C-alpha cells in the first residue's frame, strides 16, 4: 500500500569510487515506540537468492564488511559504498517492512566502468540449410565494445530495412568489461532474391567513422 | 478498555432502566463469572497460561 522508488536505475562507477543509491518512500515508516526506521537493504547476485545487507536502515548484519553504509531519515534513505571492489557488481533492493504487505524496490544494477574501446565487426550470411527451410537469416557481430551506446543499421541496395531485425546484447565480460552485440535479420526467400549487396553498418561513439562490412551475392 | 487499564470492580451492571441498587435482580447482572474447567473436556475449552513480555525504551538504559 506504500509503494517505493529507487534511483538511479543503472549506475557505472570505476573501481574504488563511491556509490550512492537512493530509496524514497510514500510515507514515513518510523515506529513511535522504539524510534527506529523500518527499512532494509538487500543484495542479489546473478543466479542466487538475495542476502540481507542492512536492517533498520543503519545497522549491518554480521559479517558484512564496513564498506557498506546506510543512512537517511524521514522518507529518504541512501546506501553508500565508500569504495567499490570487484565483487560488488550486483542488484540492490530497498524493502520496507512496516505493515503488511511488504513492498519491494525496483532494483539497482551496479556495474564497473572502463575506458572506451572500438568494436571489430563481423558478418555471417545464411548457410545452405537456412535456404531450404524458407527463412534466411543474416547476422552481424559486434565484439569487445565498451560502452553500449551504439547502433547497427543493415544495408540492402542502398535502402534501409526497419522492423525485420532483432538485437542480442551479452552481459559484461567478467575478466575485462567488454560487451558483444549480435544483430540478426530474418527475411523470406523472396526478400533474399531481392538484390545483390548485403551489408552491416555500425555506428559507435568511440569509432570516429561508421564502419561498413558488405558481402557480394556470390 | 484503554490500553493496559485494569478495572477491578464488583458493581452491579445496570443493563436496563431498573435502579436495582445492587440486588442482582431482573435486568441487573453480576459482571464477573467463573470458568468451567474439567479434565475430561475438549481442547478448545482448556486452561492456557499466558505471559506477555513488553519491551520499552525511553532513557537511562
Amino acid at each position: 500500500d506504500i509503494q517505493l522508488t529507487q534511483s538511479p536505475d543503472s549506475l557505472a562507477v570505476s573501481l574504488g569510487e563511491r556509490a550512492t543509491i537512493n530509496c524514497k518512500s510514500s510515507q514515513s515508516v518510523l515506529y513511535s515506540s522504539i524510534n527506529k526506521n523500518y527499512l532494509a537493504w538487500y543484495q542479489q547476485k546473478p543466479g542466487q537468492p538475495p542476502k540481507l545487507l542492512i536492517y533498520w536502515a543503519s545497522t549491518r548484519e554480521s559479517g558484512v564488511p564496513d564498506r557498506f553504509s546506510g543512512s537517511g531519515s524521514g522518507t529518504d534513505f541512501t546506501l553508500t559504498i565508500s569504495s567499490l571492489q570487484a565483487e560488488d557488481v550486483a542488484v540492490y533492493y530497498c524493502q520496507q517492512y512496516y505493515s503488511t504487505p511488504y513492498t519491494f524496490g525496483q532494483g539497482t544494477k551496479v556495474e564497473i566502468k572502463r575506458t572506451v574501446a572500438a568494436p571489430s565487426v563481423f558478418i555471417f550470411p545464411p548457410s545452405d540449410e537456412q535456404l531450404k527451410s524458407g527463412t534466411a537469416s543474416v547476422v552481424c557481430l559486434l565484439n569487445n565494445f565498451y560502452p553500449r551506446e551504439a547502433k547497427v543499421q543493415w544495408k540492402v541496395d542502398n535502402a534501409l530495412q526497419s522492423g525485420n531485425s532483432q538485437e542480442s546484447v551479452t552481459e559484461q565480460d567478467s575478466k575485462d568489461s567488454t560487451y558483444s552485440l549480435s544483430s540478426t535479420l530474418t527475411l523470406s526467400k523472396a526478400d533474399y532474391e531481392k538484390h545483390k549487396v548485403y551489408a552491416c553498418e555500425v555506428t559507435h561513439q568511440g569509432l570516429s567513422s561508421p564502419v561498413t562490412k558488405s558481402f557480394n551475392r556470390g | 478498555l484503554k490500553p493496559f487499564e485494569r478495572d477491578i470492580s464488583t458493581e452491579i451492571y445496570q443493563a436496563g432502566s431498573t435502579p436495582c441498587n445492587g440486588v442482582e435482580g431482573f435486568n441487573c447482572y453480576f459482571p464477573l463469572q467463573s470458568y468451567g474447567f474439567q479434565p475430561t473436556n475438549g481442547v478448545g475449552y482448556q486452561p492456557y497460561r499466558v505471559v506477555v513480555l513488553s519491551f520499552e525504551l525511553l532513557h537511562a538504559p
Binding site: 513492498t103 550470411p125 547476422v139 557481430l141 | -
Partner: protein, 220 residues
Amino acid sequence: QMQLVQSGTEVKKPGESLKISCKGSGYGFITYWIGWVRQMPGKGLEWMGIIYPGDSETRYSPSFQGQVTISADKSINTAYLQWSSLKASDTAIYYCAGGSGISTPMDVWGQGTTVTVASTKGPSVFPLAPSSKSTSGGTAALGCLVKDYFPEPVTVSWNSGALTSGVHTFPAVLQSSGLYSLSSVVTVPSSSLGTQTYICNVNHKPSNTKVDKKVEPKSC
C-alpha cells in the same frame, strides 16, 4: 540459524495442480514466520504471502489474494504453496524465506525452485560459415545458430568443453513465432583455421535432443 531446503524443480503442462514444499531444518524453529517470494525471469522480486507454522495465521498480498493457497504443517516443520490450476504465465523461480517475527527483515533464504509451463519443441541448429576473406594475420569468427527451440534453455558446448577462450554465448531472444533463437560464436586466429575441427554440441533436455554439429569453412 535454521536453514531452509526447498523441494525441487517441477515441469508441468497447463491445467494441472502443483504443490511446492519448503522444509525447515535447524534448532530454534519455534517462531519463524515463513514467507514466499516469486522472481519472474530477469525482473525484481514480488512478495506473495506469509504464514506462521502452527497457528496457521495467513496474510496475503492484494494482487495474489486467492490465486494460490499457502498452508503449513507443524509436525514436520513444512510450508506448502499450492496452485489449483496453474496457467502458462507461472514459469518463474520461487524462494521461501523465513523471518523471525512480524515486522522483521527476512534473513534466511531457501535455494528456490523454478517452474516451467509449456510444450517442448526441439532445436534446429545451423552452422554459419566463417567469411572466406578475413584477417590472415589476425582472427575470424565462426559459430552455430540454434533456432526454433522452446522453451529455454539450450546448452551449447564447444568441442566437448575443450575450447573455452573467446566463446560468446548470447541470451535467447523470442521472435514472433515464440520459439527463441540463440547464437554462440568463437573467435579463432587464421592460423588454426585449417587444422582445428569445430563441433558444437547443442543440448535441449526438455525435448531430449543432443546434437553434435560440425562447423565447416565454405570455399569455392
